[PDB]
Amino acid sequence: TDVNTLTRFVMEEGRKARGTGELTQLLNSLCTAVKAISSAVRKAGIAHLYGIAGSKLDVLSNDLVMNMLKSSFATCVLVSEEDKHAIIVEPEKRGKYVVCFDPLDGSSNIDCLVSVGTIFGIYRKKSTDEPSEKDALQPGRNLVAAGYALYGSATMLVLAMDCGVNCFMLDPAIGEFILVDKDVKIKKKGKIYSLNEGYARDFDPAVTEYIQRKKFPPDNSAPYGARYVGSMVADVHRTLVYGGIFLYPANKKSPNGKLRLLYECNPMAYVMEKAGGMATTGKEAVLDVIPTDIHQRAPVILGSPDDVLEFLKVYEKHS
Amino acid sequence: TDVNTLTRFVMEEGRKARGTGELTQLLNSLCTAVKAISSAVRKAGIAHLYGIAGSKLDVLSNDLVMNMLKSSFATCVLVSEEDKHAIIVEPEKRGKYVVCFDPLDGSSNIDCLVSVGTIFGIYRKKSTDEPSEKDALQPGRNLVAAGYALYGSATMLVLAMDCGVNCFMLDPAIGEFILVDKDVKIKKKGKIYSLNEGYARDFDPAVTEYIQRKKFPPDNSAPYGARYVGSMVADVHRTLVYGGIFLYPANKKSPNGKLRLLYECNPMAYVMEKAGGMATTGKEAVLDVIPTDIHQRAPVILGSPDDVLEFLKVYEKHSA
Amino acid sequence: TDVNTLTRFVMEEGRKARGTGELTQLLNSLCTAVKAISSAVRKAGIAHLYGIAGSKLDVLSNDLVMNMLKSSFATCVLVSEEDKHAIIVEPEKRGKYVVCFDPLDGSSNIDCLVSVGTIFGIYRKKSTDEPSEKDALQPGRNLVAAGYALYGSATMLVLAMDCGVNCFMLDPAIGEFILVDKDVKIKKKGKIYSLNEGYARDFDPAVTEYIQRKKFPPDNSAPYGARYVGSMVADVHRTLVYGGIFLYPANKKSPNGKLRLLYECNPMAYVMEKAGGMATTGKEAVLDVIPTDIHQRAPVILGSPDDVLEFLKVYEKHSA
Amino acid sequence: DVNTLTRFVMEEGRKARGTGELTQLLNSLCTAVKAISSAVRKAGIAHLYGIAGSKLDVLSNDLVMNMLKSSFATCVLVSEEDKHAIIVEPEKRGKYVVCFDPLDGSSNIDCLVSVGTIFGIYRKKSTDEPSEKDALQPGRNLVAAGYALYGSATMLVLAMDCGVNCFMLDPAIGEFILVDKDVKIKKKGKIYSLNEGYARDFDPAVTEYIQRKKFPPDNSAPYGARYVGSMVADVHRTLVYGGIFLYPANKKSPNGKLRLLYECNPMAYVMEKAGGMATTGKEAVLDVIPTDIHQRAPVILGSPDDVLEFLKVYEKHS
Numbered sequence A: 001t002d003v004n005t006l007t008r009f010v011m012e013e014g015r016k017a018r019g020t021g022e023l024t025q026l027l028n029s030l031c032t033a034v035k036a037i038s039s040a041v042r043k044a045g046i047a048h049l050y051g052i053a054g055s056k057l058d059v060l061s062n063d064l065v066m067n068m069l070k071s072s073f074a075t076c077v078l079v080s081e082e083d084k085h086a087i088i089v090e091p092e093k094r095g096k097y098v099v100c101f102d103p104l105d106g107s108s109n110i111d112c113l114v115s116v117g118t119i120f121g122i123y124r125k126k127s128t129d130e131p132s133e134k135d136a137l138q139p140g141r142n143l144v145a146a147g148y149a150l151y152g153s154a155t156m157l158v159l160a161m162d163c164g165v166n167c168f169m170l171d172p173a174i175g176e177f178i179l180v181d182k183d184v185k186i187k188k189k190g191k192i193y194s195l196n197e198g199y200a201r202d203f204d205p206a207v208t209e210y211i212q213r214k215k216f217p218p219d220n221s222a223p224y225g226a227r228y229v230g231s232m233v234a235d236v237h238r239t240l241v242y243g244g245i246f247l248y249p250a251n252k253k254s255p256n257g258k259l260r261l262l263y264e265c266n267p268m269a270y271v272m273e274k275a276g277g278m279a280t281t282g283k284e285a286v287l288d289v290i291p292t293d294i295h296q297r298a299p300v301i302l303g304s305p306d307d308v309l310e311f312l313k314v315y316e317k318h319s
Numbered sequence B, C: 001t002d003v004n005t006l007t008r009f010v011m012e013e014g015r016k017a018r019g020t021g022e023l024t025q026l027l028n029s030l031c032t033a034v035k036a037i038s039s040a041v042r043k044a045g046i047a048h049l050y051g052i053a054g055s056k057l058d059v060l061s062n063d064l065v066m067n068m069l070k071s072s073f074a075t076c077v078l079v080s081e082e083d084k085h086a087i088i089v090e091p092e093k094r095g096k097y098v099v100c101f102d103p104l105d106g107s108s109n110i111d112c113l114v115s116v117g118t119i120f121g122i123y124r125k126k127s128t129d130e131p132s133e134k135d136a137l138q139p140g141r142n143l144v145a146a147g148y149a150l151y152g153s154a155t156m157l158v159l160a161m162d163c164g165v166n167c168f169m170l171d172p173a174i175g176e177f178i179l180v181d182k183d184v185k186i187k188k189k190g191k192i193y194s195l196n197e198g199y200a201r202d203f204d205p206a207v208t209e210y211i212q213r214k215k216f217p218p219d220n221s222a223p224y225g226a227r228y229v230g231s232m233v234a235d236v237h238r239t240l241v242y243g244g245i246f247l248y249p250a251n252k253k254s255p256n257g258k259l260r261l262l263y264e265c266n267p268m269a270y271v272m273e274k275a276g277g278m279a280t281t282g283k284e285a286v287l288d289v290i291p292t293d294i295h296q297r298a299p300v301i302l303g304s305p306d307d308v309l310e311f312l313k314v315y316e317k318h319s320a
Numbered sequence D: 001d002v003n004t005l006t007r008f009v010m011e012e013g014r015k016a017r018g019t020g021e022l023t024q025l026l027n028s029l030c031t032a033v034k035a036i037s038s039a040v041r042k043a044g045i046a047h048l049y050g051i052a053g054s055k056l057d058v059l060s061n062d063l064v065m066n067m068l069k070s071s072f073a074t075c076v077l078v079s080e081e082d083k084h085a086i087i088v089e090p091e092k093r094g095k096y097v098v099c100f101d102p103l104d105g106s107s108n109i110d111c112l113v114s115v116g117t118i119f120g121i122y123r124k125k126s127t128d129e130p131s132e133k134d135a136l137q138p139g140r141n142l143v144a145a146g147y148a149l150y151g152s153a154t155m156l157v158l159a160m161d162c163g164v165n166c167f168m169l170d171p172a173i174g175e176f177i178l179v180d181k182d183v184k185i186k187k188k189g190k191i192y193s194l195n196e197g198y199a200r201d202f203d204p205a206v207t208e209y210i211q212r213k214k215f216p217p218d219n220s221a222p223y224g225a226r227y228v229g230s231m232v233a234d235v236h237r238t239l240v241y242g243g244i245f246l247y248p249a250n251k252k253s254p255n256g257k258l259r260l261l262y263e264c265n266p267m268a269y270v271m272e273k274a275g276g277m278a279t280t281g282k283e284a285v286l287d288v289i290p291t292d293i294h295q296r297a298p299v300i301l302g303s304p305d306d307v308l309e310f311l312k313v314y315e316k317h318s
């Protein structure tokens, strides 16, 4: 279409899938919560908290995502970074989908006004009986849809499916997500590497070798640039848009890494794979990992395909 | 505590100075220009480009700050990252202040929606000559006011003057800068180090030693965390808010730093120094460098006092 | 119970009806246009028309509604106030509904910032022929959905369907229409009368008695309060919220009324009747008029049922 | 050039070489009006309806009250909401008295009709300690007056000795842009505005003037009627299109309804500075010495030739 919004896109894909309408509602409701998070994160009401008339952001972000998905009547199992246990959706609001999400990723440094985001992954409930945590304990292969909302210079929702990766820009004037990049694919190889080098002491010998290769090239090529925002959303989105490699690997004081499998690693792994990129743990593909806990951690090396390959060569020489 | 706005703050400080009124109008014009830049960076109206009716961003940032400072009747000389030569203002709109600014810093990566900003530094024409580019070649210690606007997760304008550093959040619901951080001061020592380590090969020997004492500290202490947004305004603002050190040191390519002295290094150094921090080029304080060219490049190492001192002693160990 | 949005409501209503999506996609595309009208009506970006960076409102609304409805793939015949003839939709973007809309009713006095609105009514193409203006010449009982968006104090959409009348409020912080009043009903009787009494010289005796019964109540009761905004969407909505009666009757100048049947009278008559109220020409119900022209005018009297009937007993004394 | 309300008020006080108080006061009021506009337009309404799972005229009063106190520019504040004048705390007092209606018309706000904020500024002329007497000044002593209409769009209209200046809010940046400079009213217009429901209670002179507009004597066009029920909107139409607004003596209101200090006198200043007129029938609104902050007063305002035509009829019945 000429003016393709998230609302039109999500009904067309859907009609194209012969659907009942539940996922379309889930994604329009998730969309609505994304706009409300964006507003508060840009500090909309801040004057009133500072006494203009006289007289928490990740909690509000979680209450928004939760109450919108619940009201969509399309969810049964919800897994959030904020709740230690699975939300079993009250039965008069049960739909057929599992949602795992991080409502505000990077809020560790939200006081320095750094980019943050909302990460989400959506599954079809595997059961046909009673919704359980086990409906959430599915590999990334089974993802119906996954993506993130970036609150940076501007607000962007990225939605990945079998049809591909689609970037929508939020126009704050009218509250519409505007399709602005269709079927995005990654660069085969990039010139950027991304990881917290403040753990350089605790690193794996293969990770140390891959990084020196980027700073000290073996092909007399150009050394890569370094970028690490500290928000996964901003660094993964930079990796999608410009190319390169992002690493939060297993060191030694965290043998499974930091980032969570269900609502951080898997959703980005899906976006990367649909965009022609890769997402390994070192041993297997992040999407191949079988969950055993909802707040499980997994290591992750995602990004441009020839970069994740170059890492894997080193990882296996040291294995 | 009462509520305050950027506008009311700026009007009260000038009422105390019992002066012309040019600097107050200048700051109000920059204020207004930033709120406009913020709206265009947040992509208000992008639906009109994709067919809502049927019927730039770094260049538009320059056009807005240039136009708004000329309408203030407070400027005579203007220097921008975007214009090769200075802009000598029309005589009918001319005033006594020289402004140097980066209209949209970091927007060479804006496609990934990385945090970007507007950096400014205001001087007073100290000369009697006809206005020229030689009026912008004042050192940083002559700065009247400096600061930056950060278009990150939210929009904040950080204003630095002799009275201190003050941080105002942009409330988009009412279009007002709310003061939310009065007379800010930087922590004495931080736990974050900020630099592009992709240049480790061509890094001066002392930088190597300093980053290796943060990665591998022999003092049984916790190693430092690494952060580098790749946009100066976001990296500096994090260094101001959480403490730590930001470094754009000299390397093979860009051997006098890549960052610009008049509108990147000096405004950031003035904010750090007004907040009890420090900012050096290795051999000298950034503010004490006498400029030779308006687009001149300088190295920069800024942030918490103890962290910049720690680098400086490693620097004394690698020099003659 | 739970919060609801227009986008969610219109999608669930279409799912419950096991429909194709055309009405959902039309009503969603008409919503998106309404949010864009509101942003422009509230003068967002007026600063760029006055040189913030150096270098229509009823025509703009029509352009928005037209292109948004055309892009819905749910429309075949489009009748406006701005277009003398109907618009036949290009075949590749053709649907099954016929929309009659007034894209910015009240714009003639938009210089005093009077309340304005977008009135719309949606019919089914009953013809299996080629799309023509003939398809718009359907009576108002054949309406599928009718409503309006008011741009006043706040911006509110009112969407009348067979399920009833529902009022949604635009949250300009998120660009979402929040369901705030459900299955709305009009009061049985009100305390407000609304017409332009400057036409007093020209009223037929039926209007002359009724008015005097409201300023000089025979029932010993209190006199009715007078209100006339001069913008139909504002006067009709007030009559829906507070009850009472709105009148644009047959006078000399404009002898069979001024307000148009297809895109002003019929949509407000459907909202009124679905909310327990009445709308008449004096002779017949507004929804009962078979149209012959798409810009045909009609007398209109609407509002609280006791009030409309009280007039209709007065009209029936001066008939033929 | 691009001229905003903030640029305008700084330049006028720099040319008047003033302390800066008045500039801070109007700039404080400008910030409050932008906050009322956001509330009136229903920002965050989703949060009250449970988007995350979970008073306008009171909020309007609080916003102006606190923005004015914090201005360091006022000493006496009279509000339609506050039954007694507020004496500002000593450690922030200023030299100006402000009478204001924070959200005029908000009675009929369930229908989303245009509402507004009216204000007028005085200089404390007394030598005493601040008190209500500092606000019982007649409207001829006004330094500044005007209104904020929240209609189809938001406009702050500022009237001073320099003239009447109309400014439009760009809600995207939060800036009031000068869109009409040194505004004047038509000598005669073609719109009459009053509640004709109080017809049984009206004075002989009102009934006559009204019937001379609907049933004209000169065989001219009968005048058109417009009555929104909100004064800010009815008086804005009177300033832009011209004509006559009337809230006169009836019976339930022997001295009218609209209050002189924060409704009648403010709009009378705007009209006079725009070449128009504003009378009570007996005297000009600006020349009525008030004894009560919440005192009521009839007001006939609008295009000069039209208000004079009314007065000639009032003098007929005398």
Ligand SMILES: CC(C)Cc1cc([N+](=O)[O-])c2[nH]c(C(=O)O)c(CCC(=O)O)c2c1
Pocket (backbone or CB within 6 Å): A009, A010, A011, A012, A013, A014, A015, A016, A017, A018, A019, A020, A021, A022, A023, A024, A025, A027, A144, A161, A162, A163
């Ligand atoms: C790759 C795409 C073609 C998958 C897709 C996308 C959307 N979508 O863009 O919302 C969908 N919506 C719905 C619905 O229930 O209406 C379905 C069918 C349910 C299912 O089997 O998952 C669906 C499928």
Ligand SMILES: CC(C)Cc1cc([N+](=O)[O-])c2[nH]c(C(=O)O)c(CCC(=O)O)c2c1
Pocket (backbone or CB within 6 Å): B009, B010, B011, B013, B014, B015, B017, B018, B019, B020, B021, B022, B023, B024, B025, B027, B144, B145, B161, B162, B163
């Ligand atoms: C340098 C700051 C610590 C003090 C400061 C702040 C503002 N202000 O925040 O608007 C000022 N405005 C104006 C003016 O009237 O032009 C002046 C007068 C120039 C001077 O004496 O330095 C002034 C001074």
Ligand SMILES: CC(C)Cc1cc([N+](=O)[O-])c2[nH]c(C(=O)O)c(CCC(=O)O)c2c1
Pocket (backbone or CB within 6 Å): C009, C010, C011, C013, C014, C015, C017, C018, C019, C020, C021, C022, C023, C024, C025, C027, C144, C145, C161, C162, C163
């Ligand atoms: C008219 C109301 C009482 C019910 C209603 C409301 C909406 N809606 O709120 O958008 C609808 N949308 C669609 C659609 O086309 O999907 C339908 C089915 C139409 C049909 O069966 O012909 C539909 C029905």
Ligand SMILES: CC(C)Cc1cc([N+](=O)[O-])c2[nH]c(C(=O)O)c(CCC(=O)O)c2c1
Pocket (backbone or CB within 6 Å): D008, D009, D010, D012, D013, D014, D016, D017, D018, D019, D020, D021, D022, D023, D024, D026, D143, D160, D161, D162, D163
């Ligand atoms: C009444 C107008 C035609 C002139 C006017 C307008 C503004 N203004 O537009 O804000 C002013 N501001 C200030 C100030 O205090 O700086 C003054 C001077 C103070 C005084 O009245 O003695 C002033 C004068």
Ligand SMILES: O=P(O)(O)OC[C@H]1O[C@](O)(COP(=O)(O)O)[C@@H](O)[C@@H]1O
Pocket (backbone or CB within 6 Å): A104, A105, A106, A107, A108, A109, A196, A230, A231, A232, A233, A248, A258, B225
């Ligand atoms: O500070 P670290 O240890 O480098 O971790 C950074 C990582 O943690 C995260 O911040 C996630 O944790 P939070 O969401 O609590 O901030 C990632 O966004 C980011 O990639």
Ligand SMILES: O=P(O)(O)OC[C@H]1O[C@](O)(COP(=O)(O)O)[C@@H](O)[C@@H]1O
Pocket (backbone or CB within 6 Å): A225, B104, B105, B106, B107, B108, B109, B196, B230, B231, B232, B233, B258
């Ligand atoms: O890409 P590098 O070499 O790390 O340099 C980053 C620095 O260059 C800049 O991007 C220069 O700004 P521009 O993007 O506008 O050219 C700084 O903002 C930033 O601190």
Ligand SMILES: O=P(O)(O)OC[C@H]1O[C@](O)(COP(=O)(O)O)[C@@H](O)[C@@H]1O
Pocket (backbone or CB within 6 Å): C104, C105, C106, C107, C108, C109, C196, C230, C231, C232, C233, C248, C258, D224
């Ligand atoms: O001036 P009048 O005769 O009272 O007409 C008012 C009527 O004209 C209208 O303004 C017509 O709309 P327009 O302003 O777009 O022409 C109605 O909204 C309103 O009911």
Ligand SMILES: O=P(O)(O)OC[C@H]1O[C@](O)(COP(=O)(O)O)[C@@H](O)[C@@H]1O
Pocket (backbone or CB within 6 Å): C225, D103, D104, D105, D106, D107, D108, D195, D229, D230, D231, D232, D247, D257, D258
């Ligand atoms: O309702 P009436 O009697 O016609 O009076 C309307 C007048 O009352 C007002 O609404 C003021 O009273 P409120 O502020 O309580 O609404 C004026 O705006 C308006 O001019």
